[PDB]
Subunit: 215 residues, 5 copies
């Protein structure tokens, strides 16, 4: 965490243990790629020196398979940057954006504030990219209600997947309304046939979750 | 969290990690709509800038299905406000109450103290509205004791549901006394028939929980 | 938490999040009535303004059924106080002891220090009363070793119950020695017959736990 | 926790909530007697006023059966002290060592620094004594690998027990080498027969754990 | 944790409870040897006096079997040092590197800064050595997908093992590509045969995890 000194200097303070205990808890249960982890990182990532944004992503417990796909995506993002930006004095080298060469204090210095933004942007871009592919959220069309699961659950998984897929929001909407009836368990579908009637694939989630989860 | 400066200025300090770790733990187990989460938010929501009251509701892990119904309810509450309050210089625009346009420091400023109250009021109103409909608490009449569950459990679920339903407190009372015998497992009902006798549907929970959970 | 100002004033500081995370964790697993929660509250309840002692009891996650019986016991304790103390200027009204009328700062003021003590005394008295009746600890005579449970477990449940029952300590002692053999599983009883011999119902727990849990 | 004032005075600061959350978490899972709890207490017990060393041992959740055997052992240790030390002005009375009579500030005072050491010594002595007898660690000779458990597990339980038993370290060593083959599951024993050969009861744990846990 | 005084002196501050609660949580679930614990230790080990780096390794809950193999490896590393460095005034004795003789303040002093680095280097070297042998990560060739586990899981275990084995990174790469198809469950293998075709043992994990985990 970059610390702005009273003199206006920038100093490096280690990420407080409490912050990791929050990110890690979300990481192990919801998943490292999981939207939940991405939001958490962003809330606290504003003041994090590039070096930390990478180290903290590494200190996260478990999610080893994900930390593999991500590490690859980050490398690909770096390749795009080196290709997009030919080496130049103003241009920041991939290492500077990674911050690997710099010491913690050097990363905190004002010159690398642009670098921190780029590193966070790659990490967040990478986390999102892995999520649509790793399928910890999953592929929506495939997600279907387990007989044991409540329609509230099927919706939770379906909403995650419909959100994860990189598709325009209009289409997400259609997917939420149409897929909820199609992939749902037959018993909810039957109950929705009795209540929703034709609107079964035209109704909103609010109308539907009330229909099967209630009664 | 709005910070009152010694100069009397208002500054924005990020919600401390410890606060999230408490809200999140209650969120994942009891539920985001769950009365427990609502109380927690309120205890710490007094000093939260509108922007946070929304962001913190978003950083909460899981409860994706609920975060869908809520997001809709908040939008509906905004529609009521814009309809109730025609746009005016004194009137706060929905965005100002959401705080989306403002920077964190701007939200903390004294002018938007009214906005924070309205935003908290919508969030808390929305959480309560989703709870009666999502049925994480459930529909009381439907709640019934699982043979495995103790009468203490059936009461815990029944009390949650009887509280969640938006009905006058007198009626809640009648529901607590009458429903507890009706939806309870037969074995407790038989035991209560032997001890409570006629008052089975007239007795209080204290009398009843002593009857089946004890012996 | 009442804060004694350097000027000697009393100011209200919110219960720190860490304190709740401890009380809540004990609350959900051991139980709100559970002796464990009662001890925790007492350690930190010394500096808590009456309003908090009630609000914190309410912020506790789960234990909804218990929070019902308690709320009733607290009301009964208030009825005893109003009956015991006829209204008078010196007399503190039930509301003042509850602190419902006062603002947080008003509760912290020196005048209501007596009120905080009374409120804590009712809460702790109420928690103890609910425990003997709710039977989260249970009725000792009924507690018996599940075949799966170790004699160490049966003792843990039996000791909880023998302690919970409102009986003079001499009798508790007799119950601990006699009940441990009687309600224990036959296999431990047989093993104790072989080692303890006649003293089976005269031996201490130390002698007995060594007998079945060991070998 | 005794606080050394800048003036050199000693003041009493309550054990921070974070410390309990660590001790309690270790307590409920590993066990109150468990070596793990004993080490934790010692790390933080250096600055704890006798009163706390007892109160904190009491605030620990669960382990009710253990808190019974310990309470007895502490009483026995007190009996040894009163017998060993005839009452005298220099001699500290059992109550002073327990600190029950003193207020928190009085316990923190320099005069009772010797008392805190004695109280910690009894608590730690008591915890160790209960552990060899309670058998939460268990009796080594009895510990045997469950077919499901890995040889890594059997070693974890066997090492705990061989350590718990109050025997000279030389003998512990022999027990670790000999018992590991004898109480282990036959399948590991067969595999060790194939790899260790004669040294089966002469090999070290490092050699053995590599033999069955690996391959 | 060594504290640099404003005077430039070095003072010893106890490891904050929050740090242990993070290390312990990672320790009990992922494992003490687990790469996750090693990274955590390193992030916070920079300012830890040798005495702590050992004591903290000891305060870690559970992993008793591992704490045995490690304790042996640390002793072996010490033997290498005493053999590599003949005793000399400049040479640091094994005890000084362990810090057992020194008081906490003495360890924090500047003279033993070299010792702390050596102690951390042995601990980290020891943790890595135990990991390849204990097989909490396991032997890669042996790791195979359980029918229940997802190909995402098999990859998580396989990647851990391929990383743990002390082999040059080129070979790790070949192992990741070849082993993933070979040890995977037949159903994923069949699906990969249909999609990957010949590249089944030439494809990358990104290509493969998309193939079976998706669809």
């Amino acid at each position: 965490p970059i610390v702005n000194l009273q003199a206006g200097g920038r100093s490096w303070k280690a990420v407080e243990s409490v912050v990791f205990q929050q990110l890690q808890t979300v990481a192990m249960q919801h998943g490292l790629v999981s939207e939940d982890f991405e939001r958490q990182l962003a809330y606290y990532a504003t003041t994090w020196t590039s070096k930390d944004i990478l180290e903290v992503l590494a200190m996260m417990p478990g999610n080893r398979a994900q930390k593999e796909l991500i590490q690859g995506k980050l490398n690909e993002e770096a390749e795009r940057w080196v290709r997009q930006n030919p080496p130049g004095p103003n241009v920041l080298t991939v290492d500077q954006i990674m911050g690997v060469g710099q010491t913690n204090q050097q990363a905190s210095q004002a010159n690398m504030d642009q670098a921190r933004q780029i590193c966070l942007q790659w990490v967040i871009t990478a986390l999102r990219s892995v999520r649509h592919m790793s399928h910890r959220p999953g592929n929506p069309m495939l997600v279907k209600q387990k007989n044991t699961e409540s329609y509230e659950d099927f919706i939770a998984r379906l909403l995650e997947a419909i959100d994860a897929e990189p598709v325009t929001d209009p289409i997400k909407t259609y997917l939420k309304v149409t897929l909820s009836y199609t992939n749902a368990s037959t018993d909810c579908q039957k109950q929705m046939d009795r209540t929703l009637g034709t609107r079964v694939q035209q109704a909103t989630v609010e109308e539907k979750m009330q229909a099967c989860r209630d009664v």
